[model samples]
Target: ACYCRIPACIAGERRYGTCIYQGRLAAFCC
Candidate 1:
């Protein structure tokens, strides 16, 4: 699922943009 969390540094899914959502980075994950 897509989520707004910390930087997607781990190998799992994809993250979008350098900007943050709320306080975390936005990403599409499993």
Candidate 2:
């Protein structure tokens, strides 16, 4: 689910993105 494109990542790995959606992680869900 990391940001890399699919097909190349169907068996995806978890790489970090802008480190946090900058403010995407709302409370109780992180």
Candidate 3:
């Protein structure tokens, strides 16, 4: 699994990394 950080300039940015599982948007910082 790969992890990526959200852009700091974006509002409501989650503190955790994003996951790309099976080409799908799964799991979030919340």
Candidate 4:
């Protein structure tokens, strides 16, 4: 899903981008 990845970072995920979701960073697998 959107805003999904690993380690969850800013600007993105798994890498680094707009991170923010489910009260957490947008860096978690969907």
Candidate 5:
């Protein structure tokens, strides 16, 4: 399963706050 709130990101995506489409454990099951 998956769970998260997709934030509104335009450009210059970060690896902390921006976790929309990032394929990683911290981005979903963290």
Candidate 6:
């Protein structure tokens, strides 16, 4: 069993992406 969450980060031109993964599916936002 697992969970995942991903969200984009605000950092100007070169922003930081976010990603979360647990057990099954991996989520990411660019």
lDDT of 6 by residue, 1-30 (tens): 222333333333333333444544334323
TM-score of each: 0.29, 0.14, 0.28, 0.28, 0.16, 0.17
Root-mean-square deviation of Cα positions for candidate 3 versus the true structure, in angstroms? 7.4
Ranking by lDDT: 1, 4, 3, 5, 6, 2
Model 3: per-residue lDDT, tens digit, 1-30? 233433332445454655665666543444
Q: Which residue window of length 10 is worst by lDDT in model 5? A: 9-18
Q: What tens-digit string does per-residue lDDT give for candidate 5 at 1-30?
A: 333434433244433443435564333322
Alpha-carbon lDDT of model 4:
0.50
lDDT of 1 by residue, 1-30 (tens): 555545463577565445455765454444
After superposition, the stretches of candidate 5 with alpha carbons farther than 4 Å from their true spots are: 1-11, 17-30
Q: Give per-residue CA lDDT, model 2, range 1-30, as digits (tens).
A: 135332232333442333334445322211
Question: What global local distance difference test value does model 2 have?
Answer: 0.32
What do the candidate models score in CA lDDT, each in turn?
0.53, 0.32, 0.46, 0.50, 0.38, 0.35
Worst lDDT run of 10 residues, candidate 2, spans 1-10
- Which residue pairs overlap in candidate 5's backbone? none
- Tens-place lDDT digits, model 4, residues 1-30: 444654644453254354565676654433
lDDT of 6: 0.35
- TM-score between candidate 2 and the true structure: 0.14
Candidates' RMSD to native:
3.6, 9.4, 7.4, 6.3, 8.8, 8.3
Alpha carbon lDDT of residue 21, candidate 1? Answer: 58
